[PDB]
Symmetry: D2
Subunit: 230 residues, 4 copies
C-alpha cells in the first residue's frame, strides 16, 4: 500500500517544507527528497521528519559534485534513507558515490536512461545496487526490457516515465509483466494526462507495484497541493 511523493524541499521557507512532511505523514505518503544543495536544511529535515515520524524513504543526488557527496551520504546513513544517484557528473564521482554509500551500508538506486543503461548496469552489479530506468520514448522501453532480461530482471527496481505518452501505456503494461523486479513506477504529478495517470495507477496497484508521484516544485506549491496551510 505504498505511495511515494518525490519533493524538492531545499527551496523556499523551511516551515513550508515541514508542512509538506507533516501532511505526508498524515496522508500515508512516503517522501523522497530531491536535493538542490542545502545540506544544513537536509539535516534539519531529517531531524524534524524523525520528530514527526514522516518516512523519508530516500534522497536523490542529481548532478551533485564530489565535495557534496560525503556529508549527504553520511546523513542518509544516520537516518536510514535510500540513496538515489542521478545525472552523476563523471564516472569517477559516480563510482566514488556508490563506493562510499556501500561502505555505509546504504540501499543505492542508480538512475539510468537508455544511453547509459549499460554503464549503470555495470556499476549496479559491481556494487550490488539496483537500477531505476528513465523512459521518455516507447522504443526506449522495449530496448531497456531487452537489455535487462539479458542482465537479470532483479537489478531493475523501478521505472520513471516523466512524459507519459498515450502510446507508452500499453507498452509499459507489457514491460512490467516481463520485469518482476520493478517495485516502483514514477509518474509526473505535475504534467501527466490525468486519464492515463488513473489507468496506470490502477494497473500498478493491481500488480502490487508502488506508485511514485514526482512533485519537485517549490514546497509552497506542494503545501497548496496537500491543503496543508494549517
Amino acid at each position: 500500500n505504498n505511495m511515494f511523493l518525490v519533493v524538492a524541499l531545499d527551496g523556499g521557507r523551511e516551515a513550508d517544507a515541514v508542512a509538506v512532511m507533516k501532511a505526508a505523514k498524515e496522508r500515508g505518503i512516503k517522501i523522497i527528497l530531491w536535493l538542490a544543495g542545502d545540506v544544513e536544511r537536509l539535516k534539519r529535515l531529517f531531524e524534524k521528519a524523525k520528530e514527526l515520524g514522516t518516512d523519508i524513504a530516500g534522497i536523490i543526488l542529481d548532478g551533485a559534485p564530489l565535495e557534496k557527496l560525503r556529508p549527504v551520504i553520511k546523513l542518509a546513513a544516520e537516518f536510514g534513507a535510500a540513496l538515489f544517484l542521478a545525472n552523476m557528473p563523471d564516472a569517477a564521482t559516480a563510482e566514488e558515490a556508490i563506493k562510499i554509500a556501500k561502505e555505509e551500508g546504504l540501499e543505492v538506486y542508480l538512475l539510468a536512461d537508455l544511453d547509459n543503461l549499460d554503464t549503470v548496469l555495470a556499476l549496479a552489479k559491481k556494487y550490488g545496487a539496483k537500477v531505476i530506468a528513465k523512459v521518455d520514448k516507447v522504443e526506449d522501453l522495449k530496448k531497456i526490457v531487452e537489455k535487462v532480461k539479458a542482465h537479470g530482471t532483479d537489478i531493475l527496481a523501478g521505472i520513471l516515465i516523466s512524459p507519459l505518452k498515450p502510446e507508452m501505456v500499453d507498452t509499459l503494461k507489457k514491460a512490467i509483466d516481463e520485469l518482476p523486479g520493478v517495485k516502483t513506477v514514477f509518474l509526473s504529478g505535475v504534467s501527466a494526462n490525468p486519464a492515463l495517470a488513473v489507468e496506470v495507477t490502477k494497473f500498478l496497484l493491481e500488480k502490487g507495484i508502488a506508485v511514485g508521484v514526482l512533485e519537485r516544485v517549490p514546497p509552497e506549491e506542494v503545501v497548496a497541493l496537500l491543503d496543508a496551510g494549517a
Copy 2:
C-alpha cells in the same frame, strides 16, 4: 476493481467512435456514453459494442427533452445499459424518464448537486433508482453525507467530483467512509491535478471502489488518448 470511461461518441466520424470502443474493450475499460441527441449513432454504437464484445455500461441523458427519451430508453433496454439522468429540464420530465425506464426494468442513476439533492433522493426512493452526488465544494460533502444518512445510505451509489480541489481530498476520504453505498467515484480525465488523481485512485481502489474518468471531448481526441489509430 472497474474503470469507467465516460465518452461523448456523438459527433465526427463513426470509425473514431468504434476505434474508441475497440481500444476500451482491449484495455478493460467500461464505457459510458454521454449522449448529445443522435439516436441513429446510439443504435449503431450499441450494435458495434455487441459485435466487438465491448461493454457499454451506461448511457447519460443530459438536459434531454421529452421527445427524445423513449427511443433512447428503448435502445438501452434492448442492449442492457444502465440509464444515467442528469440536468433534467423539470421535475415532470425527470418523472417521465424514470417511470419509462422502470417500465423497462433499467438500472437508473440520478445525478444531483446539493441544492436539489433532497428532491432526487425522494424520487430515487419512489422508483428504486440510485443517486450520484456532484461535489464542487468541500462543505457539500458534509451536507450530502447528512442528507443521505437521513434518506438511507443505500440510495447513494456514486460521487462525481469534476473540480477535484486539494481541500476536498481528506473530506472525500472520510465521506466515502460514511457512505458504504458509494460504488463509483468520477473524476475529470481532462483537467484533474494528476497527483491528486493518483492519490484518490489509490484510495478508492483500496476501498474496493471503482474509478470513472470523464472524457467528454470529441472521439478523435479520445482516439489519440488511447493511441487507437491502428
Copy 3:
C-alpha cells in the same frame, strides 16, 4: 487581434449553451460551433445568438453524411456564418458540400491533414475556398509549406496544432513566416502546455494572427470555464 473559441454546444441543457454565447460576447470572444448532429438546436443557437448580438463566426461539419449537408448550410447562409468542413466521407461528398455552400455564397474553410492536403488544396483552388492545415507532427510543417507553395500562399488561412508539442514551437514560428496566408492558429484549450500556449499566443499576436482555442467539451464545462453562471 481576435480570439476564437471552438465550442461543442450540442448535448447540453441548452440554457448552458446560451450562457456560453452570452459570456463570449461579453468577453470579446468569437464563437465557432462544432456540430454533433442536432440541427434544431443549431437553429435555436443561431436565433438566440442574434438576440444577444453574439458573433457565431462559423460552424463545423465533422464527418457529416450527404443528407445532413444542405440543412446545415442553409442555416449558415441564413445567419451569415462561415462553414468549416472536416472529415468528409469521400471526395464526392466533399465536392457536394463545397458546391452547395458556394451556391449559397458562404465562406468555406476545408480542414486537411498532411495525407490529403494536396487534394483539399486542389478543391479549394477549384471553388475559391480556404484551407486549414492540421499539424500533429513536427515533420509535417515543412511538408505543409512545400504543398502550400506549390498552390499559392493565400490559399492556406489557418493552422491547427492539436497536440502542441515542444519541438513544434520553433518550426511553427518559421513555417508561419513562410506562409503569409495564415490568419488563424488553433490550439487546444484543454490539454496544451500552458507555457507553450503563452509563448505561441505571444508570437501570433505579434504577427497579427488570431488565436483559436478548441474547447469541445460539454457546454456545462465551458460555462464553468468562463464562470458564466450569470
Copy 4:
C-alpha cells in the same frame, strides 16, 4: 513586448541549466532565476548567461536568511539583475535586504500576498522599491486594489495569480484597468488552464503588459519544455 520565464536552475546537472539559458536566448525569453541556495552555481549561471547573451533579468530570494543576502546581492549588482524578495524570514531580515540592495543600486521587487501587503507596501516606499502582489482568491483583488490606490498605484509593478481560477479572469481584467503601475503579470506555466492562459495573455499584451510564466520545476523538465536536448 517581453516574456519572462521564472526557472529554478539550482539543482540537477548544470549543463541542463545552460541548455535552458541558451534556448531562452534563442527564443527571445528573459530569465528570472528562482534560488534554492547554491551561490557558486549562481555565479556560474551568471557567467554562462553572459557568454550566451541570455538576459538574466532577475533573481528571487525566497525565505533566505541574512547571511546569504549579501553574496547574492553582490552577484545581482555585478551582473545587472533585479532583486526579487519573497517569504522573508523576519521583518528585520527584510529591512536589511532592502537596505543592502538599495545601497548597491538594485531594482527591488517585494512580493506580498494580501496578509502582509500593508507591511510590504510600507517597506517599499521607505526604500523606493516596487511591489508584486500575489493573488489566489478573487476577493483578494478588490482589497489589494484598495490598498494600492491608498498608497499609490506607482508602487505596484506586478501581479502573480498562481491558481488562475475562472472567476478571477474578469476581476483581474478590471483590476488591471485600475493599476497603471503593473508592468508584468505572472502565470503558472505548469498547471494553469490553457484556454484561460491564452485569454489572459491576449488581454495583457493588448494593454502593453508583459507575461511571466512560472516553471520552477527541475532543469531537465524545462530543457524538455523547450527543445534544448
